[PDB]
Amino acid sequence: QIQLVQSGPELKKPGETVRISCKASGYIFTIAGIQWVQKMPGRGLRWIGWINTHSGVPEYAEEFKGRFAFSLETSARTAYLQISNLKDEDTATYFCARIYYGNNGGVMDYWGQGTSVTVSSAKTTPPSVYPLAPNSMVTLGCLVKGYFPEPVTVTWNSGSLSSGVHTFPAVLQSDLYTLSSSVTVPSSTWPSETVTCNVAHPASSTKVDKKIVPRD
Amino acid sequence: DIQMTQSPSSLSASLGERVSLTCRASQEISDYLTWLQQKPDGTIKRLIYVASSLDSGVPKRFSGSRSGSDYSLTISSLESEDFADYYCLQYANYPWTFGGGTKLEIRRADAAPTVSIFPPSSEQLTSGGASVVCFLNNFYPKDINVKWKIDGSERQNGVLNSWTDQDSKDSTYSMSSTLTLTKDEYERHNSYTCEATHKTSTSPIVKSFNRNE
Amino acid sequence: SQPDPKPDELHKSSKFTGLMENMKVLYDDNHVSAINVKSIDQFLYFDLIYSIKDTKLGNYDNVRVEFKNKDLADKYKDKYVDVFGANYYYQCYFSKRKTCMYGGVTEHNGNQLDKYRSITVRVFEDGKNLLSFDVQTNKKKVTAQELDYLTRHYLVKNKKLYEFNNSPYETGYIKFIENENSFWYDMMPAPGDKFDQSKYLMMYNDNKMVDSKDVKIEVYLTTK
């Protein structure tokens, strides 16, 4: 029954404001407050603060005061978090959680699914895809660079090659994503049998194929 | 401010092992402690509340106890879904503060990485960029270091790294390392080297190539 | 004149094992407040209902004021009054968005001062007076409830009287003194792990009033 549902992903620019919502249902809203937590990529959890839904009094952690603000619309059973002067470091997942202090078993009892905020000056840009060509085994690759936003999706020979594939998480550098993928095949396969990396980028409506050939 | 030291930060275990995360408070916190789990998925759920009470709809195998200012989470018999992140949190006074977190990964035999190196493609050089890529594949444990050399000299600027999560099949780890230069800068050197350091050997695994070849 | 609290007679906050936020929130920023309003309806014969919109959060449009008896309801029925008090939602009941409270009602006409009056609260810790602070009102006759709210609120912001978990004080009682005759309220919740907000706020249902010029306020706290 009791469930907190958060709003979808946000792609904002440096200096712009954003407003994440957390809609609660299955209980009378005024009985419990709502807290917020930041998850940064590759790092731990950080407490932002909470807000009491009776009374309206907020409590913030020092490092989030001044740019992070809590707000409410109680008739909609909805809690907002607003972030102001957006910065690269604000890129993270944000979670809401119920603080039902009316029972000792109600502190952070139910959690939201989280909202992803990505801060970049870039706008929709399609990836550039470059082949990586050079024992019983040989490794080949496919480099995908200069795109925005996530996600990009990579397969080898349309999925025929499922095993031996590593695809590495993207990294944001200078407002653009870069990503890479490895495939390892037997040397009796390549270059005799062909090997093609398939890259898709739904936001750009882009689908690119790059065969891997031996060098000149 | 109450500092919550969570130890250890990484734990290596197997299926059916009994395991135990400890977490210590720098100041009296008296049972206002809660344990949380964050899956690779991203989703977060509460495990333990008021220090020692099991959250409804979390399995028996989870429990938590106190020993003075020493708080701990125990899993009596690990299942697959349990290999996730775990955080403690105190709400005794403001600001409420999180423990550094523990990452619970699965044990296996030590394995050396497979290092390959790749020069820039023609197609990239055409557009004035020059990225040298190095895959380090199927190793264990997860700690590793990559050192790039240009004409034999350590290069730190321009490197981007990325690590896969642990493999679902063979429980290995893999890393990608990329050195981005300008075409001109790339053409101003001859040897590019990728050195991998791993606890499987005292000598690094070195892969290189030379532009002029 | 009520005699002062005996030994043991005061509630001890360490014996309350629930979360003190449940008490804090009734004496924090938000409260019911209206000026020159008439009751629009009635549910039971000892209550009256007012249309008062919550300016801050919009948690309520209609406020049920419950009194100790029928004669208090009938005195203020359809008369233009001022309302001030601490409201609750849990177990609040009558018949768009609703809230409940007790007393806090005073006639508007003839009860207004041209400039705010200051009443000096005197705060005692373990018998010793450590500080004083003023609370303001513009009514000639003000409810004890209003003055209680204003005194605790200050204490909540500046003395951490009620925090999220517990309190730094063990006992506490607010004493009102009009010329010779005094009475007091116990500032702490009952023992156990739960706190009945309705049942606690009911102490205000007699609608007791004091004269803003004559009245003296004294809060006696005890440390841990």
mmCIF file of N, CA, C and O in Angstrom, chain A residues 35 37 39 44-47 50 59 95 99 104-109 111 130-134 139-141 143 145 166-169 171 173 180-182 210 215, chain B residues 34 36 38 42 44 46 49-50 55 87 89 91 94-96 98 116 118-121 123-124 127 131 133 135 137-138 160-164 169 174-176 180:
data_model
loop_
_atom_site.group_PDB
_atom_site.id
_atom_site.type_symbol
_atom_site.label_atom_id
_atom_site.label_comp_id
_atom_site.label_asym_id
_atom_site.label_seq_id
_atom_site.Cartn_x
_atom_site.Cartn_y
_atom_site.Cartn_z
ATOM 1 N N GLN A 35 12.163 13.178 4.057
ATOM 2 C CA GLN A 35 13.588 13.509 3.975
ATOM 3 C C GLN A 35 14.116 13.355 2.564
ATOM 4 O O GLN A 35 13.503 12.689 1.732
ATOM 5 N N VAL A 37 17.892 12.534 0.337
ATOM 6 C CA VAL A 37 19.243 11.998 0.362
ATOM 7 C C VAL A 37 19.853 12.072 -1.030
ATOM 8 O O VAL A 37 19.181 11.818 -2.022
ATOM 9 N N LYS A 39 22.668 10.594 -3.657
ATOM 10 C CA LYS A 39 23.628 9.553 -4.031
ATOM 11 C C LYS A 39 24.475 10.109 -5.155
ATOM 12 O O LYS A 39 23.951 10.453 -6.217
ATOM 13 N N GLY A 44 29.474 7.469 -1.518
ATOM 14 C CA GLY A 44 28.443 7.097 -0.537
ATOM 15 C C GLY A 44 27.179 7.944 -0.539
ATOM 16 O O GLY A 44 26.995 8.807 -1.397
ATOM 17 N N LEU A 45 26.301 7.675 0.427
ATOM 18 C CA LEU A 45 25.068 8.448 0.616
ATOM 19 C C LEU A 45 25.330 9.654 1.520
ATOM 20 O O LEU A 45 26.171 9.610 2.427
ATOM 21 N N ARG A 46 24.580 10.720 1.269
ATOM 22 C CA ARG A 46 24.757 11.998 1.943
ATOM 23 C C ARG A 46 23.359 12.508 2.284
ATOM 24 O O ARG A 46 22.472 12.494 1.429
ATOM 25 N N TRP A 47 23.161 12.943 3.529
ATOM 26 C CA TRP A 47 21.859 13.427 4.001
ATOM 27 C C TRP A 47 21.687 14.907 3.676
ATOM 28 O O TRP A 47 22.519 15.726 4.047
ATOM 29 N N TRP A 50 15.312 16.996 6.084
ATOM 30 C CA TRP A 50 13.893 16.606 6.001
ATOM 31 C C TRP A 50 12.974 17.774 6.327
ATOM 32 O O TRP A 50 13.417 18.822 6.809
ATOM 33 N N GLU A 59 14.624 21.003 8.182
ATOM 34 C CA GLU A 59 15.958 20.886 8.763
ATOM 35 C C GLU A 59 16.942 20.446 7.681
ATOM 36 O O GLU A 59 16.780 19.374 7.103
ATOM 37 N N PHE A 95 16.868 10.757 -3.624
ATOM 38 C CA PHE A 95 15.881 9.855 -3.055
ATOM 39 C C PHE A 95 15.076 10.576 -1.984
ATOM 40 O O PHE A 95 15.632 11.365 -1.225
ATOM 41 N N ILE A 99 9.386 9.923 6.892
ATOM 42 C CA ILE A 99 9.740 10.092 8.288
ATOM 43 C C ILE A 99 8.445 10.106 9.104
ATOM 44 O O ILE A 99 7.896 11.170 9.431
ATOM 45 N N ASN A 104 7.818 4.697 16.577
ATOM 46 C CA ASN A 104 9.282 4.546 16.617
ATOM 47 C C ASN A 104 9.817 3.667 15.496
ATOM 48 O O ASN A 104 11.018 3.687 15.214
ATOM 49 N N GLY A 105 8.931 2.902 14.856
ATOM 50 C CA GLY A 105 9.300 2.074 13.708
ATOM 51 C C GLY A 105 9.055 2.723 12.355
ATOM 52 O O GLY A 105 9.038 2.035 11.337
ATOM 53 N N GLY A 106 8.881 4.040 12.329
ATOM 54 C CA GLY A 106 8.517 4.724 11.099
ATOM 55 C C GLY A 106 9.538 5.698 10.539
ATOM 56 O O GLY A 106 9.233 6.430 9.592
ATOM 57 N N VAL A 107 10.746 5.722 11.096
ATOM 58 C CA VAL A 107 11.784 6.622 10.595
ATOM 59 C C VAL A 107 12.448 5.981 9.374
ATOM 60 O O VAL A 107 13.044 4.905 9.485
ATOM 61 N N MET A 108 12.303 6.633 8.213
ATOM 62 C CA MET A 108 12.807 6.137 6.921
ATOM 63 C C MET A 108 12.278 4.753 6.564
ATOM 64 O O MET A 108 13.044 3.905 6.099
ATOM 65 N N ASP A 109 10.986 4.519 6.784
ATOM 66 C CA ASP A 109 10.411 3.174 6.593
ATOM 67 C C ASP A 109 10.185 2.838 5.115
ATOM 68 O O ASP A 109 10.477 1.721 4.678
ATOM 69 N N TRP A 111 10.824 4.129 1.032
ATOM 70 C CA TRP A 111 11.702 4.945 0.207
ATOM 71 C C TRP A 111 11.129 5.150 -1.182
ATOM 72 O O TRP A 111 10.350 4.332 -1.667
ATOM 73 N N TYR A 130 34.459 4.820 -33.424
ATOM 74 C CA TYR A 130 35.751 4.489 -34.048
ATOM 75 C C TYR A 130 36.160 3.062 -33.703
ATOM 76 O O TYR A 130 36.031 2.651 -32.548
ATOM 77 N N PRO A 131 36.668 2.308 -34.693
ATOM 78 C CA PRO A 131 37.057 0.914 -34.483
ATOM 79 C C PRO A 131 38.404 0.763 -33.776
ATOM 80 O O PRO A 131 39.293 1.597 -33.944
ATOM 81 N N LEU A 132 38.551 -0.300 -32.995
ATOM 82 C CA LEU A 132 39.823 -0.611 -32.351
ATOM 83 C C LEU A 132 40.286 -1.995 -32.785
ATOM 84 O O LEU A 132 39.776 -3.014 -32.303
ATOM 85 N N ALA A 133 41.240 -2.013 -33.716
ATOM 86 C CA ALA A 133 41.861 -3.242 -34.193
ATOM 87 C C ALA A 133 43.307 -3.273 -33.713
ATOM 88 O O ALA A 133 43.923 -2.218 -33.541
ATOM 89 N N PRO A 134 43.859 -4.481 -33.504
ATOM 90 C CA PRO A 134 45.198 -4.701 -32.952
ATOM 91 C C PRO A 134 46.255 -3.672 -33.369
ATOM 92 O O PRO A 134 46.646 -3.625 -34.532
ATOM 93 N N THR A 139 41.553 -9.723 -29.039
ATOM 94 C CA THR A 139 40.598 -8.742 -28.525
ATOM 95 C C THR A 139 40.421 -7.593 -29.512
ATOM 96 O O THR A 139 41.400 -7.046 -30.007
ATOM 97 N N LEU A 140 39.171 -7.245 -29.798
ATOM 98 C CA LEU A 140 38.840 -6.103 -30.649
ATOM 99 C C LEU A 140 37.981 -5.142 -29.855
ATOM 100 O O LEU A 140 37.442 -5.493 -28.804
ATOM 101 N N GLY A 141 37.823 -3.934 -30.374
ATOM 102 C CA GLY A 141 37.078 -2.918 -29.654
ATOM 103 C C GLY A 141 36.316 -1.947 -30.522
ATOM 104 O O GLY A 141 36.396 -1.970 -31.752
ATOM 105 N N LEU A 143 35.127 2.216 -29.949
ATOM 106 C CA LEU A 143 35.160 3.443 -29.140
ATOM 107 C C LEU A 143 34.038 4.392 -29.577
ATOM 108 O O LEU A 143 33.895 4.686 -30.768
ATOM 109 N N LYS A 145 32.322 8.111 -28.696
ATOM 110 C CA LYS A 145 32.737 9.344 -28.035
ATOM 111 C C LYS A 145 31.967 10.583 -28.499
ATOM 112 O O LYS A 145 31.544 10.677 -29.647
ATOM 113 N N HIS A 166 32.639 -7.083 -23.033
ATOM 114 C CA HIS A 166 32.575 -6.126 -21.936
ATOM 115 C C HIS A 166 32.172 -4.794 -22.530
ATOM 116 O O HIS A 166 32.783 -4.336 -23.499
ATOM 117 N N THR A 167 31.131 -4.182 -21.979
ATOM 118 C CA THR A 167 30.821 -2.801 -22.310
ATOM 119 C C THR A 167 30.930 -1.978 -21.037
ATOM 120 O O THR A 167 30.309 -2.294 -20.022
ATOM 121 N N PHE A 168 31.746 -0.933 -21.102
ATOM 122 C CA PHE A 168 32.108 -0.167 -19.925
ATOM 123 C C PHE A 168 31.171 1.009 -19.736
ATOM 124 O O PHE A 168 30.766 1.629 -20.711
ATOM 125 N N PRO A 169 30.809 1.311 -18.478
ATOM 126 C CA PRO A 169 29.994 2.490 -18.199
ATOM 127 C C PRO A 169 30.569 3.758 -18.813
ATOM 128 O O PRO A 169 31.789 3.902 -18.928
ATOM 129 N N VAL A 171 31.441 7.844 -19.161
ATOM 130 C CA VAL A 171 32.019 8.838 -18.268
ATOM 131 C C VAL A 171 31.781 10.216 -18.870
ATOM 132 O O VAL A 171 31.933 10.399 -20.075
ATOM 133 N N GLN A 173 32.960 13.842 -19.433
ATOM 134 C CA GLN A 173 34.112 14.738 -19.421
ATOM 135 C C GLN A 173 33.888 15.871 -20.422
ATOM 136 O O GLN A 173 33.581 15.619 -21.589
ATOM 137 N N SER A 180 33.248 2.768 -24.186
ATOM 138 C CA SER A 180 34.025 1.791 -24.937
ATOM 139 C C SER A 180 33.512 0.379 -24.708
ATOM 140 O O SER A 180 32.860 0.108 -23.702
ATOM 141 N N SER A 181 33.800 -0.514 -25.652
ATOM 142 C CA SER A 181 33.372 -1.915 -25.560
ATOM 143 C C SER A 181 34.432 -2.854 -26.131
ATOM 144 O O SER A 181 35.043 -2.559 -27.158
ATOM 145 N N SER A 182 34.639 -3.978 -25.449
ATOM 146 C CA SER A 182 35.583 -5.005 -25.880
ATOM 147 C C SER A 182 34.825 -6.217 -26.353
ATOM 148 O O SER A 182 33.814 -6.583 -25.762
ATOM 149 N N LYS A 210 30.066 -0.281 -37.345
ATOM 150 C CA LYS A 210 31.484 -0.186 -37.713
ATOM 151 C C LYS A 210 32.169 -1.547 -37.709
ATOM 152 O O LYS A 210 32.432 -2.120 -36.647
ATOM 153 N N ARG A 215 44.727 -3.085 -39.836
ATOM 154 C CA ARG A 215 45.264 -1.770 -40.222
ATOM 155 C C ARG A 215 46.108 -1.749 -41.505
ATOM 156 O O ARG A 215 46.466 -2.798 -42.046
ATOM 157 N N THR B 34 19.829 3.036 12.024
ATOM 158 C CA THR B 34 19.087 2.272 11.022
ATOM 159 C C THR B 34 20.026 1.764 9.928
ATOM 160 O O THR B 34 20.953 2.462 9.517
ATOM 161 N N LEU B 36 20.533 0.376 6.029
ATOM 162 C CA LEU B 36 19.938 0.460 4.699
ATOM 163 C C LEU B 36 20.737 -0.362 3.701
ATOM 164 O O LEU B 36 21.949 -0.553 3.850
ATOM 165 N N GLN B 38 21.405 -0.579 -0.512
ATOM 166 C CA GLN B 38 21.226 -0.071 -1.872
ATOM 167 C C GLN B 38 21.753 -1.089 -2.868
ATOM 168 O O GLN B 38 22.954 -1.361 -2.910
ATOM 169 N N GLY B 42 19.967 0.336 -7.837
ATOM 170 C CA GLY B 42 19.819 1.715 -7.395
ATOM 171 C C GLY B 42 18.860 1.800 -6.222
ATOM 172 O O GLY B 42 18.994 2.682 -5.374
ATOM 173 N N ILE B 44 16.678 1.512 -2.856
ATOM 174 C CA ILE B 44 17.089 1.540 -1.461
ATOM 175 C C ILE B 44 15.938 1.072 -0.586
ATOM 176 O O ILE B 44 14.807 1.513 -0.761
ATOM 177 N N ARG B 46 15.080 -0.126 3.746
ATOM 178 C CA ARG B 46 15.511 -0.171 5.134
ATOM 179 C C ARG B 46 15.548 -1.617 5.585
ATOM 180 O O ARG B 46 14.639 -2.384 5.275
ATOM 181 N N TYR B 49 15.745 -1.304 12.104
ATOM 182 C CA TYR B 49 15.325 -0.031 12.716
ATOM 183 C C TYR B 49 15.399 -0.092 14.239
ATOM 184 O O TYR B 49 15.336 -1.172 14.825
ATOM 185 N N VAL B 50 15.530 1.070 14.869
ATOM 186 C CA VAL B 50 15.891 1.168 16.289
ATOM 187 C C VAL B 50 17.053 0.222 16.652
ATOM 188 O O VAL B 50 16.998 -0.526 17.627
ATOM 189 N N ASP B 55 13.183 -4.897 10.028
ATOM 190 C CA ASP B 55 12.164 -4.242 9.213
ATOM 191 C C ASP B 55 11.247 -5.293 8.596
ATOM 192 O O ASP B 55 11.718 -6.303 8.074
ATOM 193 N N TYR B 87 24.576 0.660 4.204
ATOM 194 C CA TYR B 87 24.895 1.886 4.931
ATOM 195 C C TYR B 87 24.207 1.900 6.288
ATOM 196 O O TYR B 87 23.050 1.511 6.376
ATOM 197 N N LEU B 89 23.012 4.522 9.491
ATOM 198 C CA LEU B 89 22.652 5.932 9.693
ATOM 199 C C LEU B 89 22.151 6.230 11.106
ATOM 200 O O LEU B 89 21.245 5.559 11.607
ATOM 201 N N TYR B 91 20.232 8.913 13.615
ATOM 202 C CA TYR B 91 19.342 10.071 13.709
ATOM 203 C C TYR B 91 19.165 10.523 15.163
ATOM 204 O O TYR B 91 18.063 10.902 15.569
ATOM 205 N N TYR B 94 21.022 16.358 14.927
ATOM 206 C CA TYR B 94 21.256 16.943 13.609
ATOM 207 C C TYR B 94 22.704 17.378 13.428
ATOM 208 O O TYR B 94 23.343 17.814 14.385
ATOM 209 N N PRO B 95 23.233 17.259 12.195
ATOM 210 C CA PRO B 95 22.606 16.622 11.036
ATOM 211 C C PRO B 95 22.644 15.100 11.144
ATOM 212 O O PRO B 95 23.573 14.553 11.732
ATOM 213 N N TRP B 96 21.638 14.422 10.604
ATOM 214 C CA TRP B 96 21.664 12.965 10.586
ATOM 215 C C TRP B 96 22.732 12.577 9.597
ATOM 216 O O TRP B 96 22.818 13.170 8.539
ATOM 217 N N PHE B 98 25.418 9.571 7.639
ATOM 218 C CA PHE B 98 25.555 8.223 7.092
ATOM 219 C C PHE B 98 26.950 7.666 7.341
ATOM 220 O O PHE B 98 27.936 8.395 7.279
ATOM 221 N N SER B 116 45.289 -5.413 -23.505
ATOM 222 C CA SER B 116 45.437 -5.084 -24.930
ATOM 223 C C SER B 116 45.589 -3.562 -25.066
ATOM 224 O O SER B 116 45.074 -2.810 -24.230
ATOM 225 N N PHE B 118 45.377 -0.289 -28.122
ATOM 226 C CA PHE B 118 44.931 0.059 -29.483
ATOM 227 C C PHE B 118 45.272 1.507 -29.824
ATOM 228 O O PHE B 118 44.907 2.414 -29.083
ATOM 229 N N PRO B 119 45.978 1.729 -30.952
ATOM 230 C CA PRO B 119 46.209 3.094 -31.419
ATOM 231 C C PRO B 119 44.938 3.776 -31.910
ATOM 232 O O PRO B 119 43.896 3.132 -32.049
ATOM 233 N N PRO B 120 45.021 5.079 -32.188
ATOM 234 C CA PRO B 120 43.888 5.783 -32.769
ATOM 235 C C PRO B 120 43.550 5.265 -34.160
ATOM 236 O O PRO B 120 44.439 4.829 -34.885
ATOM 237 N N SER B 121 42.277 5.329 -34.528
ATOM 238 C CA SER B 121 41.852 4.923 -35.861
ATOM 239 C C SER B 121 42.148 6.026 -36.874
ATOM 240 O O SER B 121 42.332 7.183 -36.506
ATOM 241 N N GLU B 123 39.917 7.100 -38.896
ATOM 242 C CA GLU B 123 38.685 7.887 -38.867
ATOM 243 C C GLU B 123 38.655 8.962 -37.790
ATOM 244 O O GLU B 123 37.992 9.987 -37.961
ATOM 245 N N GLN B 124 39.365 8.732 -36.689
ATOM 246 C CA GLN B 124 39.482 9.736 -35.640
ATOM 247 C C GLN B 124 40.518 10.784 -36.023
ATOM 248 O O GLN B 124 40.267 11.985 -35.912
ATOM 249 N N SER B 127 39.441 13.618 -38.094
ATOM 250 C CA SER B 127 38.754 14.733 -37.428
ATOM 251 C C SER B 127 39.561 15.398 -36.299
ATOM 252 O O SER B 127 38.990 16.070 -35.436
ATOM 253 N N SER B 131 42.827 9.320 -29.573
ATOM 254 C CA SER B 131 42.600 8.583 -28.336
ATOM 255 C C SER B 131 43.264 7.223 -28.390
ATOM 256 O O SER B 131 43.006 6.440 -29.309
ATOM 257 N N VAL B 133 43.607 3.661 -26.473
ATOM 258 C CA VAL B 133 42.753 2.877 -25.579
ATOM 259 C C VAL B 133 43.443 1.614 -25.070
ATOM 260 O O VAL B 133 44.190 0.960 -25.798
ATOM 261 N N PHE B 135 42.377 -1.874 -22.803
ATOM 262 C CA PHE B 135 41.470 -2.751 -22.078
ATOM 263 C C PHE B 135 42.270 -3.653 -21.156
ATOM 264 O O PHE B 135 43.288 -4.224 -21.571
ATOM 265 N N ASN B 137 41.227 -6.877 -18.895
ATOM 266 C CA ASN B 137 40.032 -7.718 -18.828
ATOM 267 C C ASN B 137 40.121 -8.974 -17.960
ATOM 268 O O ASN B 137 41.136 -9.671 -17.947
ATOM 269 N N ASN B 138 39.024 -9.233 -17.245
ATOM 270 C CA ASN B 138 38.790 -10.469 -16.508
ATOM 271 C C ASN B 138 39.808 -10.746 -15.408
ATOM 272 O O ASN B 138 40.454 -11.801 -15.398
ATOM 273 N N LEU B 160 41.016 8.943 -19.038
ATOM 274 C CA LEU B 160 39.707 8.600 -18.471
ATOM 275 C C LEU B 160 39.641 7.095 -18.200
ATOM 276 O O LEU B 160 40.066 6.284 -19.029
ATOM 277 N N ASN B 161 39.102 6.732 -17.039
ATOM 278 C CA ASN B 161 38.971 5.332 -16.644
ATOM 279 C C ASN B 161 37.519 4.955 -16.339
ATOM 280 O O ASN B 161 36.705 5.801 -15.939
ATOM 281 N N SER B 162 37.207 3.678 -16.542
ATOM 282 C CA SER B 162 35.873 3.152 -16.305
ATOM 283 C C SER B 162 35.988 1.696 -15.910
ATOM 284 O O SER B 162 36.750 0.955 -16.514
ATOM 285 N N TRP B 163 35.239 1.290 -14.895
ATOM 286 C CA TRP B 163 35.295 -0.072 -14.389
ATOM 287 C C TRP B 163 33.906 -0.678 -14.461
ATOM 288 O O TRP B 163 32.943 -0.056 -14.031
ATOM 289 N N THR B 164 33.805 -1.886 -15.012
ATOM 290 C CA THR B 164 32.561 -2.660 -14.959
ATOM 291 C C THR B 164 32.289 -3.091 -13.524
ATOM 292 O O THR B 164 33.222 -3.228 -12.727
ATOM 293 N N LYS B 169 28.735 -13.934 -14.445
ATOM 294 C CA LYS B 169 29.127 -15.305 -14.791
ATOM 295 C C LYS B 169 30.325 -15.804 -13.982
ATOM 296 O O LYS B 169 30.209 -16.763 -13.215
ATOM 297 N N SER B 174 36.744 -5.879 -14.843
ATOM 298 C CA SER B 174 37.399 -5.357 -16.035
ATOM 299 C C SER B 174 37.454 -3.834 -15.985
ATOM 300 O O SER B 174 36.617 -3.188 -15.347
ATOM 301 N N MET B 175 38.449 -3.267 -16.660
ATOM 302 C CA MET B 175 38.665 -1.821 -16.668
ATOM 303 C C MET B 175 39.024 -1.361 -18.070
ATOM 304 O O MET B 175 39.681 -2.092 -18.822
ATOM 305 N N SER B 176 38.577 -0.153 -18.406
ATOM 306 C CA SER B 176 38.923 0.508 -19.652
ATOM 307 C C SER B 176 39.665 1.785 -19.302
ATOM 308 O O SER B 176 39.241 2.511 -18.411
ATOM 309 N N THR B 180 43.366 10.609 -24.179
ATOM 310 C CA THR B 180 42.969 11.507 -25.260
ATOM 311 C C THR B 180 43.977 12.636 -25.445
ATOM 312 O O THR B 180 44.237 13.396 -24.508
#
